[PDB]
């Protein structure tokens, strides 16, 4: 269930580009792919918290994201998956999707903010899953034989993989300060603020409400709010608060893997000649299929090759 | 298939960070100076030393 | 089941030493810096000394800095404190306590573990 | 050598009141200050820490505050159980810790 993440929070984080071609810090930037099936179904991990609330409720339909100093919601009906073209998601939960994507190089994720704003998030992926059995094919049959394959299951309970989370770091905010003839205001705005600066004033500490330093310029000091009740997931693009990171509790990771049967089609029977010893057979594939052969004795002599097209083979 | 965990960077703006030595499977571990890292809100160390 | 156990103590005279130790259980000692405290009658808490990991730093309060030295046993989870030329100054309940980390330079943490002090006495 | 003030001796008050108790420092030591609770008897337990941070197995009635340069120890609800002498300490980023007097709560009567 959810009740794990009722002391959680969403957190921003740097992505490489978003989608403009330039890097920037955005809501919606992926922390890692996970790609252990076989059966080409993806496991993404995102800074984006699916079905839950920012008023901690259990709901579906909708996500959570960080904006600026606050948790905001959004429709989980905008959410969305891409690589070479657009993904399928087979299921959410918290900081994980699951779906079916396309073959492509690249992949991305994002969403349509409170402000009908789009975010998305753009990272280097190789995608391009394993063939199962011998023949390539590009979608399941109406028949054919069933081989052995990995998958990712529903279950959202009992992984006993766990992610760990830590009280954030001070977030820096240079819109909390800003210059007033002479003086600087401060503007906490409800949320403890740190301040310091090589000023004659030497007027350093902390405020929870509004505080005029009176001396110095707004161009000349520092600050950042440091009074957090939620804690989240220690990213590797969030600096650590202390050597070892405090108020600590767990996550468990959603969709275990698991062992399932894939099907994979059967190519139609070539035509078969004969003449002296020797096999002459047309082969007629729809999409790549691999033929073999060996010698049923002490030098097998064996030997492979893929076939693209119709071919006349000899043996 | 083998999987490498990153945790997040520990910064000291005003000092050097120490390092201990662990017994995990392949570990490694170093410190870098000079650095001044950045946040969407702007700079996250107040320290330029 | 995380614990220090306080061992030695009693009375000395003054000029003489005394050898105080701690037993470490329920924690990697290694995995911890740690330090002794002590509270005389009447009074607060006392900051007397202190060791990192692998003895990488080694601090005294100014008043012991010349008279008392600390050590500490991997192999054995034990922590030492050897006093020398104690004087009736030195009267107090010794603590030992651990960090909340390797390294005594983070001032993001305080003394999570103290155990049960014991009763040095120092009078002729 | 930088010594911490703190209320001068004792607090009263009585169950269900708000106790307000804070700790300062003459010169700059640290970004952050730790609270400590002890009773007669035994030894001291880690109360908060970083000044923000509640240690484990601690009731929610304690949390962390501060002004300026001031840090402050606050009990939203004072209960029987809460009454101890209070300490506050800050390392300097050194071995050397440096511990204040700590202030004691009184029965109101």
């Known amino acids: 269930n959810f009740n794990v993440y009722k002391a959680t929070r969403p957190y921003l984080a740097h992505c490489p580009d978003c989608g403009e071609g330039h890097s920037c810090h955005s809501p919606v930037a992926l922390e890692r792919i996970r790609n252990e099936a076989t059966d080409g179904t993806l496991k993404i991990q995102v800074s984006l918290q699916i079905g839950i609330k920012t008023d901690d409720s259990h709901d579906w339909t909708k996500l959570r994201y960080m904006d600026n100093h606050m948790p905001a919601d959004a429709e989980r009906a905008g959410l969305f998956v891409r690589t070479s073209a657009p993904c399928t998601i087979t299921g959410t939960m918290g900081h994980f999707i699951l779906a079916r994507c396309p073959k492509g190089e690249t992949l991305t994720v994002g969403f349509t903010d409170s402000r009908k704003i789009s975010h998305s998030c753009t990272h280097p992926f190789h995608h391009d899953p394993p063939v199962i059995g011998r023949e390539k094919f590009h979608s399941r049959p109406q028949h054919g034989k069933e081989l052995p394959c990995s998958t990712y299951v529903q279950s959202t309970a009992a992984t006993t993989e766990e992610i760990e989370v830590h009280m954030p770091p001070d977030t820096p905010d240079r819109t909390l300060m800003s210059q007033q003839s002479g003086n600087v205001k401060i503007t906490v705005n409800g949320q403890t603020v740190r301040y310091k600066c090589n000023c004659g004033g030497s007027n350093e500490g902390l405020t929870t409400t509004d505080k005029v330093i009176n001396n110095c310029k707004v161009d000349q000091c520092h600050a950042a709010v440091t009074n957090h009740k939620k804690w989240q997931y220690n990213s590797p693009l969030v600096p650590r608060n202390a050597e070892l990171g405090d108020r600590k509790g767990k996550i468990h990771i959603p969709f275990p893997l698991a062992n399932v049967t894939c099907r994979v089609p059967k190519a139609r029977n070539p035509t078969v000649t004969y003449g002296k010893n020797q096999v002459i057979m047309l082969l007629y594939p729809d999409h790549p299929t691999l033929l073999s052969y060996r010698n049923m004795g002490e030098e097998p002599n064996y030997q492979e090759e893929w076939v693209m097209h119709k071919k006349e083979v000899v043996l | 298939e083998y999987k490498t965990v990153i945790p997040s960077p520990y910064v000291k703006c005003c000092g050097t960070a120490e390092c201990k030595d662990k017994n995990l499977p392949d570990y490694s571990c170093k410190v870098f100076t000079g650095v001044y890292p950045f946040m969407w809100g702007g700079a996250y160390c107040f320290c330029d030393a | 089941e995380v614990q220090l156990v306080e061992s030695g103590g009693g009375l000395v005279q003054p000029g003489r030493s005394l050898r105080l130790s701690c037993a470490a259980s329920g924690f990697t000692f290694d995995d911890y810096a740690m330090h002794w405290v002590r509270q005389a009658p009447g009074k607060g808490l006392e900051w007397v000394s202190g060791?990192?990991?692998?003895?990488?730093?080694?601090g005294y309060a100014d008043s012991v800095k010349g008279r008392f030295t600390i050590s500490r046993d991997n192999a054995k989870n034990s922590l030492y404190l050897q006093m020398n030329s104690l004087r009736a100054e030195d009267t107090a309940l010794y603590y030992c306590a651990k960090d909340m980390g390797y390294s005594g330079n983070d001032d993001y943490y305080g003394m999570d573990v103290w155990g049960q002090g014991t009763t040095v006495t120092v009078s002729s | 050598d930088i010594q911490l003030t703190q209320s001068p001796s004792s607090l009263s008050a009585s169950v269900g009141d708000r106790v307000t108790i804070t700790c300062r420092a003459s010169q700059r030591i640290s970004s952050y200050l730790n609270w400590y609770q002890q009773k007669p008897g035994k030894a001291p337990k880690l109360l908060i820490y970083g000044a923000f941070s509640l240690q484990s197995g601690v009731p929610s009635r304690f949390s962390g505050s501060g002004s300026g340069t001031d840090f402050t120890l606050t009990i939203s609800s004072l209960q029987p159980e809460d009454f101890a002498t209070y300490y506050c300490?800050?390392?300097?980023?050194?071995?050397?810790?440096?511990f204040g007097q700590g202030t004691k709560v009184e029965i109101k009567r």
């Open positions: 060791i990192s990991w692998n003895s990488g730093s080694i």
């Open positions: 300490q800050q390392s300097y980023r050194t071995l050397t810790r440096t």
